[PDB]
Amino acid sequence: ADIVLFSGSKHVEFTDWGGTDWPSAYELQPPYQTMPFDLNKNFEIKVDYSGADIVLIFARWEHGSKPQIWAQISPYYVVDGTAVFTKEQIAKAYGSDDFSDLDYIGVKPLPSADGMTVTKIVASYT
């Protein structure tokens, strides 16, 4: 499967850390939503984009005395305008590939002048 997570054209503005928000090309909260792809399989996220450097985030909020994880990864490669982030890379930044307590997944720009445009996001099994 090539699962189409997003298709079309979505332009995002993000200029500075001081701002009112840090928007996303694409976001999921695994505890509050059905997952559109399987995290226990060996996935890749492929993003067709333009403009700002893009990152993929897997986050677990601080709970009790288990600390917050904010695992923010750059693509494995970007080629001809498509960034590819792999499970290996995110599982390494997250500390494990145990995504049980996973709270948030986002595809987000880093600060720029032009912002980022996304035309397509795909989940893929390796």
Side-chain angles (χ1 to χ4, degrees):
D2 218 58
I3 302 151
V4 181
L5 299 187
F6 173 83
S7 204
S9 196
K10 174 168 207 202
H11 178 83
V12 129
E13 281 292 283
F14 181 57
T15 259
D16 199 335
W17 294 110
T20 100
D21 69 284
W22 183 15
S24 303
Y26 186 85
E27 272 194 326
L28 291 154
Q29 306 191 84
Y32 307 132
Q33 281 177 307
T34 67
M35 288 283 90
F37 75 92
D38 187 346
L39 290 152
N40 305 310
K41 296 213 220 283
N42 192 24
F43 63 86
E44 268 187 350
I45 312 305
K46 306 183 196 172
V47 184
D48 293 357
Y49 79 115
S50 225
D53 284 350
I54 183 182
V55 296
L56 173 70
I57 294 161
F58 270 31
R60 182 188 74 188
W61 314 119
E62 192 188 339
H63 178 64
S65 313
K66 268 258 102 199
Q68 175 170 285
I69 302 178
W70 180 271
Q72 177 170 311
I73 247 39
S74 279
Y76 194 35
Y77 56 91
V78 176
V79 163
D80 299 351
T82 299
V84 186
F85 298 97
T86 70
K87 181 170 184 177
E88 71 136 287
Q89 283 188 106
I90 204 58
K92 289 182 182 155
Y94 193 75
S96 93
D97 65 359
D98 182 2
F99 300 133
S100 275
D101 285 328
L102 183 53
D103 297 313
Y104 176 69
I105 295 165
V107 173
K108 292 182 141 343
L110 287 196
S112 55
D114 298 319
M116 161 196 283
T117 303
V118 176
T119 65
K120 200 187 191 160
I121 309 170
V122 159
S124 208
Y125 305 130
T126 306

